[PDB]
Amino acid sequence: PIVQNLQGQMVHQCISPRTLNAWVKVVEEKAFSPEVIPMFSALSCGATPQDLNTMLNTVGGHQAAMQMLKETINEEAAEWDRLHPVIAPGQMREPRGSDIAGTTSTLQEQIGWMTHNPPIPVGEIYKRWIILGLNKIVRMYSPTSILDIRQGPKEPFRDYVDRFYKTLRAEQASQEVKNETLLVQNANPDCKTILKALGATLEEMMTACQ
Amino acid sequence: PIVQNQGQMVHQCISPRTLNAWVKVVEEKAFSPEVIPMFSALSCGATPQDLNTMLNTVGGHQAAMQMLKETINEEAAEWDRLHPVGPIAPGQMREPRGSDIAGTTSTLQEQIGWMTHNPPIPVGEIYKRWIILGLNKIVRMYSPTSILDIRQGPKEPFRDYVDRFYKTLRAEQASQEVKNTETLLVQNANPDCKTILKALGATLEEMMTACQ
Amino acid sequence: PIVQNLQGQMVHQCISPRTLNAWVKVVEEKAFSPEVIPMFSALSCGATPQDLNTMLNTVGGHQAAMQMLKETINEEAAEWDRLHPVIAPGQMREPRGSDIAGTTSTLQEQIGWMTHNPPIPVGEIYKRWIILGLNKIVRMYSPTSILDIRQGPKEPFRDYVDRFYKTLRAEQASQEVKNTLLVQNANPDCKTILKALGPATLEEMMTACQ
Amino acid sequence: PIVQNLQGQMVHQCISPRTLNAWVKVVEEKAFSPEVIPMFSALSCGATPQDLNTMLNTVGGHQAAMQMLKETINEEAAEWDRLHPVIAPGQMREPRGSDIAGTTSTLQEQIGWMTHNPPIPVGEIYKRWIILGLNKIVRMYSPTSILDIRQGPKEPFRDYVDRFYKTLRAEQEVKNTETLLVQNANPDCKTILKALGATLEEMMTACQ
Amino acid sequence: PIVQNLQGQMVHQCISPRTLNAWVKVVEEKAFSPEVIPMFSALSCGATPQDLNTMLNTVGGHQAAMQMLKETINEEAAEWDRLHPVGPIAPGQMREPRGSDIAGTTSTLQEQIGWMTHNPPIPVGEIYKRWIILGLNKIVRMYSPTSILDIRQGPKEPFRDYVDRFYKTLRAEQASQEVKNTETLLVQNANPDCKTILKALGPATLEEMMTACQ
Amino acid sequence: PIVQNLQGQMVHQCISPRTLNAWVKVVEEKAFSPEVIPMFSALSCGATPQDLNTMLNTVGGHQAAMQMLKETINEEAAEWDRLHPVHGPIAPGQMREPRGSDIAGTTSTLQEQIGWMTHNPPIPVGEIYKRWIILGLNKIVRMYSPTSILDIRQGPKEPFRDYVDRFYKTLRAEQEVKNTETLLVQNANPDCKTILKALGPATLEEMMTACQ
Ligand SMILES: COc1ccc(-n2c([C@H](Cc3cc(F)cc(F)c3)NC(=O)CN3CCN(S(=O)(=O)c4ccc(N)cc4)CC3=O)nc3ccccc3c2=O)cc1
Ligand SMILES: COc1ccc(-n2c([C@H](Cc3cc(F)cc(F)c3)NC(=O)CN3CCN(S(=O)(=O)c4ccc(N)cc4)CC3=O)nc3ccccc3c2=O)cc1
Ligand SMILES: COc1ccc(-n2c([C@H](Cc3cc(F)cc(F)c3)NC(=O)CN3CCN(S(=O)(=O)c4ccc(N)cc4)CC3=O)nc3ccccc3c2=O)cc1
Ligand SMILES: COc1ccc(-n2c([C@H](Cc3cc(F)cc(F)c3)NC(=O)CN3CCN(S(=O)(=O)c4ccc(N)cc4)CC3=O)nc3ccccc3c2=O)cc1
Ligand SMILES: COc1ccc(-n2c([C@H](Cc3cc(F)cc(F)c3)NC(=O)CN3CCN(S(=O)(=O)c4ccc(N)cc4)CC3=O)nc3ccccc3c2=O)cc1
Ligand SMILES: COc1ccc(-n2c([C@H](Cc3cc(F)cc(F)c3)NC(=O)CN3CCN(S(=O)(=O)c4ccc(N)cc4)CC3=O)nc3ccccc3c2=O)cc1
């Protein structure tokens, strides 16, 4: 990553083993559950594109997902190249899409762009792209539609809701589309009665159905 | 988080140690009360971004986490009432709205600016306050039993009963005036103990010795 | 905690996850075995009262013990307030009992008191109180009286002694009061052997009975 | 490794136990699965040739692979010696192939070359060679040809693809994908896939 | 412990949790096997007497051993007090430590640091450590199950195993390494088949004896 | 060990618990498999002779091996004393030449050891002693090696790769004399030996493909 020495300067560090291991475990244990994204994002704090490639490369298995991911990166790099078409000796060049994915850039270039003032945050840009791709995967790997999350007849409301919102987190839509109407619909009769009786916070709905 | 290098205050990444610690806490302890202090400790120094990171890494408990978002909305709206916010002065640092504190509408730089500025606007600590509010409501929610239903089993050692009593009591939300203890504790004691305890006019230490 | 930067200044750090986890494990694994006290004391090296509260709060279960602990803290804070009753703008105020327990003080105050020269070691004072309470608990949680630690007829002396001293460690009295019963409670075969020596090191007694 | 002190200077550190253990575990758990290469590369960030030797030496087992590896290093060192044939008192000498593998160089030389301006990145060069050898091994240890990765008749497309690309990784103009993937798909899917002109996302939706 | 800041000065740190845990595990896993001593010594690198007390206090169980240990410390502190007797101290100045100051009983942490970091150092940490290690040796011998005399090579026991037992057992026992000075009782206690073979060589390296009996 | 402070100076550190534990585990898990040597060498990066003694002392069990090791150290210290005999009473203040036993950390203090190592030019007593220990560790590894390379014959149902793995593992335990693809072919089973003999004495890669 790039991080700040107790002096003041911004310097390149290696990825820790702690971070490497953390990432592999995440992927091993949690597949492409949604909470992988924030965990990836956190574990890639400071990351150069090189570090992001390292991280993705250490993922074995899920190679369909990872090819899908490469496709999503191609799309976003091509779009970057549309919006910013691209040389002076000594000076620092503008990065193409493929420079951001760390394909055509060297580490030094990547550091140059990131630590320059103002920064070209190629790490953060590539990360944005990877996270796009990771969302598409998470939805892909999502087993069940939110429509098929119905409260079991002997299912405590809380459990149902847990499933509801877990499932909902996996899917991709405007948070307008994601914004407690299907929650009530899919509730079981006993609860739906109780919930329909109110005009309500989730806290209220969960108390009411407890 | 924000922490101290030399002498200057600087942004660090969240450690993997901290991330893992938080996930484990939530995996192992659900929303047992001791999650709150553990969250608070593990979020020492945290920017709102770090707090979001932490909450995002929680998979499962998504009902709780939506409940949490609601509690944050309530407190942000109230913040916006108490501190209304033009085009800001160029260069200068703007007043944060509620949603800036939850790290929704602020950038990391803004968040750092507010926290490290002198005097500090401790957006990290404010958001943390809100999250902890929400976490308490959840802990009460996830609490299975009312303190009224904590009755000493007929073959239950007093100490165990008390452990349950106070564990259960910790889960519930009220002024410690309302929680103020050694009245329902005695009531709910089993006969053998209730006799012994009623005999005294007493510390918990004394009650536990007496019933041992 | 408060600890020293490689420069020289005394500065506040967060509690490490390592320390948090260490403390929880201690309590999970060892309950209120006596060796919890020194382990708590070590893990609270440098601690502000805030850190001490954090640590105690992370203990789930043993809530009877922890209420008992709060009572012991009340006693000692009230006594502090007896011995030291009692504001100037800018200046640093004298801490009441409840300021030491971190109830009524802010972190800044706590740091102020501790890092001031001369120090008001509120961390160390509160720690003293907590350790008082922890001793009362350890005695409480102690199953057996030292009087009831009798060497089994087929029990190796060393085991007996191990039990003896473990049990003895749990109980609360001046080490004058703890400073005879080891020999008394020994089984006949050993008691003969031990009585044969002139009121002897433990090493000697354990060799003699081996 | 060679890494940067909070001051600013470049200095030699020992390999951490964390790194050593990490590497051994990788090799124990993942054998010569492809993701070992990037994991080796990451864990050898900063490495002197000495550190690279250390790392390879700590691998017990897979001694066939490791001899194969030595052969690949010989080839690349000999080639280095062809392309750069090879002292002034005080001054720093040009490294032969065997100096890069850390066989004939001392640690000091290795540091000298790496930290000199401009750098002679013997660490990175040797690493390049090791990674060459590691690829040959990964292909060796690969059980199945991409030709023999056929979608089972009751195999979900995603699983098939996972196998396809895992297998493909073990073996990029030549690797260039959405031609043998379709060929080897089972009938039901091949129909559906042939119907499109397509991203993998699209193909996987279509076959789901 | 006392350790050196990246500047240059010597400063007190807390004991790490890593160190605490390490010590407890050692004692849990390895009891009073001999390799506990060097492990204690290593884990107590830099230690103040306070840190040494902390470490010993975190040991639960083995309380017989730990009382034995206290006795050994009393003996050595009393002897210290004989060899270095100690008025009201000069104001400001640093006092001579009694035995009980070295065990961290009567000294404060500040005193302990003062003694250790002063030039020349009074290495109270290292002295107390010396005492603890004395006591730990007596314990290790105590907890040692078998005498070296009773380590006889089994009739179907490979020599190497026998030797492993021999020297493990020998390590547990306390005498001058003159008294421990090896390849005499090792041969005696060897089983017949080996004793023949070993006696055939002229009083030989251990390597040679182990090859010969393989 | 001796290592470099982020300033620039060379300073003594304690051995980490991480390093101690690492070493013990290595020895527990891997006995005297050959890869213990490089692992020891790595874990003893920076080591004073004191640190090397610490490390060896923490090894319980394998006490035969460890006595064998002491013998190997005696041999090499005596030889050191032959090649470098020691000067009267030493110059006051000045740093003395180390005898063999000073290098094994038997007769030297830590300060002396640091003095020798950090002096310019360095007397690398750590590295010298390490050399000796590694000599002894090799003799042990060969000792603890169960099988001769001659007795590594490819099983009739043994995949070549496995055979080779055994071959070279075994060979590592025991480089002109070690120089290889001659006994490897000899000891191959008939089916493979045919195939391998067909190629003109070939890389190992080629031999392993051919026999796969
Ligand atoms: C498409 O965007 C890309 C493509 C490549 C990289 N890239 C990479 C990426 C990082 C990566 C990993 C992922 F899991 C998912 C991602 F999205 C990104 N790794 C690789 O490409 C390595 N790698 C080899 C090729 N194949 S394959 O199966 O044989 C194959 C062959 C042909 C076709 N058509 C399809 C697949 C698998 C594979 O992994 N590694 C770098 C390492 C060192 C320096 C540079 C790079 C760099 O640039 C980065 C982004
Ligand atoms: C309610 O206040 C908020 C709202 C959003 C955030 N927020 C967040 C928060 C952090 C968070 C996590 C919690 F578990 C609980 C909390 F209270 C806070 N997480 C997310 O938004 C991620 N996320 C996706 C959306 N849903 S959902 O189920 O599809 C869904 C969709 C619509 C409706 N109406 C209900 C549910 C689940 C989910 O998590 N992550 C950020 C990351 C990067 C920058 C910014 C942010 C930021 O702003 C923070 C506080
Ligand atoms: C008794 O002295 C005290 C009392 C409270 C605190 N204190 C604390 C303490 C620290 C603590 C934890 C212990 F396990 C044991 C201890 F002795 C000390 N914790 C709490 O107050 C948290 N907490 C909630 C209340 N109860 S209860 O069961 O509902 C309950 C209900 C009715 C009655 N009458 C009594 C108790 C349990 C509980 O835990 N946490 C702080 C955090 C942030 C800033 C400040 C504080 C601060 O001041 C510290 C010392
Ligand atoms: C081939 O290129 C080389 C050759 C040697 C080294 N090298 C090394 C290498 C590192 C290494 C490890 C690998 F797994 C794979 C690699 F490719 C590279 N390790 C060793 O040499 C150790 N080692 C000895 C030789 N054999 S063997 O079985 O006896 C043998 C003998 C004859 C024949 N024909 C076949 C096999 C096994 C063995 O392991 N260790 C160093 C350590 C200290 C300083 C220097 C060195 C250095 O130079 C490095 C690269
Ligand atoms: C004998 O020399 C000593 C005596 C006491 C200490 N000492 C200590 C020592 C350190 C220690 C631990 C060991 F495992 C072994 C050692 F050798 C040394 N620990 C204790 O005192 C704790 N402790 C309490 C007393 N008993 S007991 O069973 O009730 C008991 C009762 C009656 C009789 N006659 C004998 C024992 C058990 C016990 O454990 N802890 C300090 C902590 C804070 C500041 C100071 C001290 C300090 O000075 C250090 C050395
Ligand atoms: C021969 O070279 C030596 C001899 C001794 C040391 N040495 C040591 C060495 C380090 C060491 C460990 C090894 F596993 C193997 C090695 F080769 C080297 N350790 C010991 O001496 C510890 N130790 C105790 C004695 N015995 S025994 O079985 O009772 C015994 C008694 C008599 C006879 N004849 C045979 C065996 C076993 C034992 O273990 N520890 C130091 C620690 C503190 C300061 C100094 C020293 C120092 O000098 C170092 C090198």
PDB file of C-alpha atoms in Angstrom, chain E residues 15 19 22-24 26-27 31-49 51-59 66 69 73 125-137, chain F residues 20 54 57-58:
ATOM      1  CA  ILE E  15       4.617  -6.518  29.196  1.00  0.00           C
ATOM      2  CA  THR E  19       4.584 -12.289  26.212  1.00  0.00           C
ATOM      3  CA  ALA E  22       3.424 -17.045  25.738  1.00  0.00           C
ATOM      4  CA  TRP E  23       4.475 -17.580  29.360  1.00  0.00           C
ATOM      5  CA  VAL E  24       1.185 -19.024  30.496  1.00  0.00           C
ATOM      6  CA  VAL E  26       4.666 -22.525  28.201  1.00  0.00           C
ATOM      7  CA  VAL E  27       3.724 -23.401  31.765  1.00  0.00           C
ATOM      8  CA  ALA E  31       4.898 -27.848  33.156  1.00  0.00           C
ATOM      9  CA  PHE E  32       8.455 -27.769  34.576  1.00  0.00           C
ATOM     10  CA  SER E  33      10.215 -29.529  31.764  1.00  0.00           C
ATOM     11  CA  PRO E  34      13.783 -28.073  31.647  1.00  0.00           C
ATOM     12  CA  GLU E  35      13.171 -26.032  28.479  1.00  0.00           C
ATOM     13  CA  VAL E  36      10.820 -23.858  30.533  1.00  0.00           C
ATOM     14  CA  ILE E  37      13.835 -22.131  32.165  1.00  0.00           C
ATOM     15  CA  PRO E  38      15.386 -20.776  28.901  1.00  0.00           C
ATOM     16  CA  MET E  39      11.902 -19.972  27.692  1.00  0.00           C
ATOM     17  CA  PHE E  40      11.191 -18.021  30.892  1.00  0.00           C
ATOM     18  CA  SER E  41      14.565 -16.315  30.611  1.00  0.00           C
ATOM     19  CA  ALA E  42      13.886 -15.312  26.984  1.00  0.00           C
ATOM     20  CA  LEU E  43      10.334 -14.161  27.670  1.00  0.00           C
ATOM     21  CA  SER E  44      11.669 -12.099  30.603  1.00  0.00           C
ATOM     22  CA  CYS E  45      14.266 -10.331  28.447  1.00  0.00           C
ATOM     23  CA  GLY E  46      14.419  -6.744  29.717  1.00  0.00           C
ATOM     24  CA  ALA E  47      12.219  -7.501  32.732  1.00  0.00           C
ATOM     25  CA  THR E  48      11.982  -5.355  35.841  1.00  0.00           C
ATOM     26  CA  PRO E  49      11.441  -7.347  39.093  1.00  0.00           C
ATOM     27  CA  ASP E  51       7.577  -7.830  35.423  1.00  0.00           C
ATOM     28  CA  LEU E  52       9.096 -11.002  36.883  1.00  0.00           C
ATOM     29  CA  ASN E  53       6.489 -10.960  39.692  1.00  0.00           C
ATOM     30  CA  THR E  54       3.738 -10.372  37.136  1.00  0.00           C
ATOM     31  CA  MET E  55       4.972 -13.346  35.160  1.00  0.00           C
ATOM     32  CA  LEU E  56       5.115 -15.657  38.190  1.00  0.00           C
ATOM     33  CA  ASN E  57       1.758 -14.421  39.445  1.00  0.00           C
ATOM     34  CA  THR E  58       0.083 -15.306  36.137  1.00  0.00           C
ATOM     35  CA  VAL E  59       1.042 -18.919  36.802  1.00  0.00           C
ATOM     36  CA  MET E  66       5.682 -21.584  43.328  1.00  0.00           C
ATOM     37  CA  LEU E  69      10.247 -20.860  44.437  1.00  0.00           C
ATOM     38  CA  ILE E  73      14.128 -16.426  46.616  1.00  0.00           C
ATOM     39  CA  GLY E 125      16.041  -7.405  36.933  1.00  0.00           C
ATOM     40  CA  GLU E 126      18.934  -9.688  36.026  1.00  0.00           C
ATOM     41  CA  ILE E 127      19.748 -10.471  39.678  1.00  0.00           C
ATOM     42  CA  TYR E 128      16.177 -11.435  40.599  1.00  0.00           C
ATOM     43  CA  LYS E 129      16.016 -13.414  37.331  1.00  0.00           C
ATOM     44  CA  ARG E 130      19.161 -15.283  38.472  1.00  0.00           C
ATOM     45  CA  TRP E 131      17.357 -16.133  41.724  1.00  0.00           C
ATOM     46  CA  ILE E 132      14.143 -17.193  40.008  1.00  0.00           C
ATOM     47  CA  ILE E 133      16.121 -19.405  37.658  1.00  0.00           C
ATOM     48  CA  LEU E 134      17.873 -20.970  40.673  1.00  0.00           C
ATOM     49  CA  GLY E 135      14.450 -21.796  42.109  1.00  0.00           C
ATOM     50  CA  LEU E 136      13.179 -23.007  38.745  1.00  0.00           C
ATOM     51  CA  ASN E 137      16.064 -25.490  38.503  1.00  0.00           C
TER      52      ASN E 137
ATOM     53  CA  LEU F  20      10.632 -18.351  20.057  1.00  0.00           C
ATOM     54  CA  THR F  54      18.359 -19.463  23.937  1.00  0.00           C
ATOM     55  CA  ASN F  57      17.860 -24.407  24.950  1.00  0.00           C
ATOM     56  CA  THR F  58      14.136 -24.017  24.225  1.00  0.00           C
TER      57      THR F  58
END
